[PDB]
RNA sequence: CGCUGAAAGCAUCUAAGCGGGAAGCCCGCCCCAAGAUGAGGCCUCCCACGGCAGCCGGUAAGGACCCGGGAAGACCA
RNA sequence: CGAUGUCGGCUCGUCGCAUCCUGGGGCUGAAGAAGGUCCCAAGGGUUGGGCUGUUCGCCCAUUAAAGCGGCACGCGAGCUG
C-alpha cells in the first residue's frame, strides 16, 4: 500500500542533485526542477532516489507520495520522455503541421492553429492522429487537454478530438 | 449538476469528494454529479 | 500620440463622393514646442506646445524667461500633449493625414445656471391638468426618514456648460497645410474662436 | 507633591525593518512607540513618542487566508460608493498602506492621535529618506 | 392598498 | 471545466503546485480632482531695502482697483 | 392623538436579488434549431396603447425582455387630488 516509501529507480545516466526544497533532474533529454517540500527528505542512493517523511501525520503522509511521484516523473521525463496521442475523428476533420505549429481543421468556419510552447513538440504521422511530446509530464498532458478542448468529443457522434485509448460512449438521438 | 443540502451517492459508482471546502458527488453517470448547496 | 492646439473656426459641409460631409474647420498649425517634460526631469513624458503669437508688450517677465529658455517668440497659449514627443521643434497639421481618426477637446458652450430640464433632460411637470407652478421643477428629491438625506451627486439645477469636453473618434476629412487647416467631420465642442486640442484618437 | 510633567523633549527617531514581521503584532508595537508609552515620563496630552521609520513594508506577513480574504473598505458618500479592495491587491498597488492602515487604527482618535500618526514614516522597499535624522535601528 | 384617511384634509 | 497529484499501490481539479473561465470585478475611456493640511512636481521671474520665526515704512517680480467688453456670468468668478 | 397628512397617479431616483432580458455555465427524457431545470451573475436594460380612481388585473400591438420587492405600502414644506 505505498508510494512515498517505494524507491525511485534512476537509470544510467540521469543525475539527481538535491537542494533544500527543490531537486534537479538531468538526463539525455534535458533538465527539470522539482519543487519539493522543505519537510520531506529526498535521499540519493546508488541508482536510486528515495523520499522520507518526518512523521505519520496526515499532511506528511500526503506530501510523501506526491513528492516521490513528482520526482519519479521527472526522472522518466528526462530519460524516456513523455507523450500523449490524440486521434481526430469525423469527416471534415484533419490535422497538419505548419512549421513547428499545429493546425486543426475541425468544422469551425476557420482552422485552429496551436503554437507549441517551449518544451512541447507537435507531430502529425497520419492526418487524423496528433502526438504531443515533451520532458515535462504535466506540460504535455496540459497541452494535450488544450488541443482536445478545441473540439470535444461529441455526445452523439464519433466526431471531434479524442485522446488515444479514450473510449467512445455515445447516446441516442431519437 | 444537482445542487442540494442533501448530497448522497445515487448509484454504486458514485464517489463523494471534498473539493475547495465543498462536498461534491462525482460519477461516470453525469446525472449523479452533485454539489452540496 | 500626436497632438496639436488650434482654434475652431466654423462648420460647413464639403462634398466627397456624392456625399455631403458636415465638417468643423480647425486652424491648427503651427505650434512651437516650448518645453519637453521628461521622466528624469518631470516624472512623465509630454510636450508643452505654444500657440498664437502674442504681443511682447503683454508678456510679463516670468513668462518671457520661460519663452527665452526655448528660443521661442512669445505665444498666447501654452498647453501640453501627453506621451507625445515630436522630433521637430515645431508641430503642424502635417502630423495628420486625411482618413485618420482624432479626439477633439474643447471648452463647451456655457449655459449658465441651468434648470433641470436643460441640464439633465428631466421631464418636468404637466402643463395643465392642475399642475401648480411646477412645470419645470424636478419633482421629488428623496425618500422620507430613511435615509433622511439627499444623495451626493443628485442631479439638480446649477451651472452647465463652459466645461472641458472631448468628442471622440472624429474623421480627418482633409488637411490644408498651406493654411494650417484641419477639417474634421462632425462637431467640436465650444464656440467658433474657442481654443481646442486635436489628438490622435484612442479608439481602435 | 504633584506628578512630574516633562518639559519639551527632543524626539527620538527609530527604524524598524518590517520584512517578515506579522502585520498586526508589529502594528501594536509601532503604536506604543508612537504614543510614547515606553517612556517613564509618558504624558497623555502631548506628543512625546518616537518618530518611527519602517522599511520593507511590502514584505509584511499575514497568517491564514488573509491575502485573499481581508478586505479593506472605502466609502465615497455617493450611491453605490463602497469600494472593497483585498489585501493582495492593496499590497500589489500601495503596500505601505497596509501597515499604515493598521497602525492608524491602533492610535487614539482625536487631534493628538492624528498627530502621532503623522510621526510614522512607512516605506515599501529597503530604503528611506530620513538619514538626516540618523534613525536608531530598533529590533522589535 | 386603499385604506381610509386617518386624518381629515387640512 | 481541466493538468499534474498524494493521503488512500486504484481513483480524485487539491491536500503541494499549475491552467481555462462571465454583460459582472480591477485597469483601460471621459470628467473632477493637491484643503491629497499626506496641502505634490516642473519651467520661468524677483531678491539678499531701510527703523526698531516681531512690529512699522518704501519697493521688486508681480497683483488688485478703475474702465471697454465677452457664445463667461444671478452677484461673485 | 398641545397632529408622525392618509390610496392611486406624476416627477425623481436609489437599493435588494429569491434574475424578466442580455453574459457565463452543469444536467436534460440536450440530433439540430428551440426548450426544460438548476448554478454563477445586479453592469446595463426592462416599450406604446384600450378599460377602470384604481394598485392589481384583463385585453391590443410590439419586444432581447416586457422581473419581483425595499426605501414612513420611497417621494403632497415636490405637483396632482
Ligand atoms: Mg545517482
Ligand atoms: Mg534517513
Ligand atoms: Mg429532441
Ligand atoms: Mg433525496
Ligand atoms: Mg446506493
Ligand atoms: Mg469517478
Ligand atoms: Mg482647452
Ligand atoms: Mg453663457
Ligand atoms: Mg428645469
Ligand atoms: Mg443636457
Ligand atoms: Mg430635451
Ligand atoms: Mg414628459
Ligand atoms: Mg413637457
Ligand atoms: Mg398631464
Ligand atoms: Mg389647485
Ligand atoms: Mg401654471
Ligand atoms: Mg410622505
Ligand atoms: Mg440617515
Ligand atoms: Mg462655469
Ligand atoms: Mg477630400
Ligand atoms: Mg459657435
Ligand atoms: Mg517595546
Ligand atoms: Mg503608492
Ligand atoms: Mg473614547
Ligand atoms: Mg477526467
Ligand atoms: Mg489524473
Ligand atoms: Mg481506496
Ligand atoms: Mg492548492
Ligand atoms: Mg483557477
Ligand atoms: Mg481547459
Ligand atoms: Mg484568466
Ligand atoms: Mg458590451
Ligand atoms: Mg486636469
Ligand atoms: Mg497645492
Ligand atoms: Mg492640479
Ligand atoms: Mg486623509
Ligand atoms: Mg504646490
Ligand atoms: Mg470688469
Ligand atoms: Mg459684465
Ligand atoms: Mg395621533
Ligand atoms: Mg409638538
Ligand atoms: Mg402641529
Ligand atoms: Mg412630519
Ligand atoms: Mg387620502
Ligand atoms: Mg423601485
Ligand atoms: Mg443568485
Ligand atoms: Mg443565457
Ligand atoms: Mg441546443
Ligand atoms: Mg430535437
Ligand atoms: Mg441550461
Ligand atoms: Mg446546478
Ligand atoms: Mg443588473
Ligand atoms: Mg446597481
Ligand atoms: Mg433592476
Ligand atoms: Mg378613446
Ligand atoms: Mg388607461
Ligand atoms: Mg389599471
Ligand atoms: Mg381589478
Ligand atoms: Mg430570448
Ligand atoms: Mg404594460
Ligand atoms: Mg405596508
Ligand atoms: Mg407612501
Ligand atoms: Mg413602490
Ligand atoms: Mg405618498
Ligand atoms: Mg398638498
Ligand atoms: Mg400621494
Ligand atoms: Mg414630504
Ligand atoms: Mg410637509
Ligand atoms: Mg415634511
Ligand atoms: Mg415638484
Ligand atoms: Zn452514480
From Swiss-Prot, chain A:
Q: Which GO terms describe its biological process?
A: cytoplasmic translation
Q: Please name the Pfam families in this protein's record.
A: Ribosomal_L6 (PF00347)
Has the keyword Ribosomal protein been applied to this entry? yes
GO MF term list: rRNA binding; structural constituent of ribosome
Gene Ontology terms: cellular component: cytosolic large ribosomal subunit
List keywords of the entry alphabetically: Ribonucleoprotein, Ribosomal protein, RNA-binding, rRNA-binding
Is-annotated flag, keyword Chaperone?
no
Function as written in the Swiss-Prot or TrEMBL entry:
This protein binds to the 23S rRNA, and is important in its secondary structure. It is located near the subunit interface in the base of the L7/L12 stalk, and near the tRNA binding site of the peptidyltransferase center.
Fetch the PANTHER family from UniProt: 60S/50S RIBOSOMAL PROTEIN L6/L9 (PTHR11655), LARGE RIBOSOMAL SUBUNIT PROTEIN UL6M (PTHR11655:SF14)
**Family in the record:** Belongs to the universal ribosomal protein uL6 family.
Subunit relationships: Part of the 50S ribosomal subunit.
Q: What is this protein called?
A: Large ribosomal subunit protein uL6
Give the organism, scientific name: Thermus thermophilus (strain ATCC 27634 / DSM 579 / HB8)
Gene behind this protein: rplF
From Swiss-Prot, chain B:
Which InterPro entries does the annotation name?
A: Ribosomal_bL36 (IPR000473), Ribosomal_bL36_sp (IPR035977)
Regarding protein family, the annotation reads: Belongs to the bacterial ribosomal protein bL36 family.
> Cofactor: bound how, per the entry note?
Binds 1 zinc ion per subunit.
Assembly notes: Part of the 50S ribosomal subunit.
Which cofactors are reported in the record for this sequence?
Zn(2+)
Instruction: List keywords of the entry alphabetically.
Output: Metal-binding, Ribonucleoprotein, Ribosomal protein, Zinc
What are the boundaries of the signal sequence?
none
Q: What is this protein called?
A: Large ribosomal subunit protein bL36
The UniProt annotation places Zn(2+) binding at 11, 14, 27, 32
Q: List the disulfide bonds.
A: none
Give Gene Ontology CC terms.
cytoplasm; ribonucleoprotein complex; ribosome
Curated annotation (Swiss-Prot), chain C:
Mod. after translation: The mass differences between the observed and calculated masses are suggested to be due to methylation, which is known to occur in the E.coli and R.palustris orthologs.
Q: What job does the chain carry out? A: One of the primary rRNA binding proteins, it binds directly near the 3'-end of the 23S rRNA, where it nucleates assembly of the 50S subunit.
* PROSITE patterns with a match to the protein in the record: RIBOSOMAL_L3 (PS00474)
- Family annotation (InterPro entries): Ribosomal_uL3, Ribosomal_uL3_bac/org-type, Ribosomal_uL3_CS, Transl_B-barrel_sf
**Which organism was this protein described from?**
Thermus thermophilus (strain ATCC 27634 / DSM 579 / HB8)
Q: Which GO terms describe its biological process?
A: translation
* Keywords, alphabetical: Methylation, Ribonucleoprotein, Ribosomal protein, RNA-binding, rRNA-binding
The record's section on HAMAP family has: Ribosomal_uL3_B
Protein name in the entry: Large ribosomal subunit protein uL3
The family classification in the record reads: Belongs to the universal ribosomal protein uL3 family.
Q: How does it assemble?
A: Part of the 50S ribosomal subunit. Forms a cluster with proteins L14 and L19.
Superkingdom of the source species = Bacteria
Does this UniProt record's set of keywords contain Amino-acid biosynthesis?
no
Please spell out the taxonomic lineage of the organism that makes this protein: Bacteria, Thermotogati, Deinococcota, Deinococci, Thermales
Q: Name one GO cellular component term.
A: cytosolic large ribosomal subunit
| Single GO MF descriptor | structural constituent of ribosome
UniProtKB/Swiss-Prot annotation, chain D:
Per its UniProt record, what SUPFAM superfamilies does this chain match?
Ribosomal protein L13 (SSF52161)
Say yes or no: keyword Ribonucleoprotein present: yes
One CC-aspect GO term: cytosolic large ribosomal subunit
Family annotation (InterPro entries): Ribosomal_uL13 (IPR005822), Ribosomal_uL13_bac-type (IPR005823), Ribosomal_uL13_CS (IPR023563), Ribosomal_uL13_sf (IPR036899)
Q: Which GO terms describe its molecular function?
A: mRNA binding; structural constituent of ribosome
Q: Which UniProt keywords apply?
A: Ribonucleoprotein, Ribosomal protein
Reply yes or no: does the keyword Lipoprotein apply. Answer: no
Question: Could you tell me the Gene Ontology terms of the biological process aspect for this record?
Answer: negative regulation of translation; translation
**Role according to the record:** This protein is one of the early assembly proteins of the 50S ribosomal subunit, although it is not seen to bind rRNA by itself. It is important during the early stages of 50S assembly.
**What PANTHER family does this protein's entry cite?**
LARGE RIBOSOMAL SUBUNIT PROTEIN UL13M, RIBOSOMAL PROTEIN L13
The entry's family comment says: Belongs to the universal ribosomal protein uL13 family.
Q: Which HAMAP family match?
A: Ribosomal_uL13
Q: How does it assemble?
A: Part of the 50S ribosomal subunit.
- Any idea what this protein is called? Large ribosomal subunit protein uL13
At the highest ranks, the source species' classification is: Bacteria, Thermotogati, Deinococcota, Deinococci, Thermales
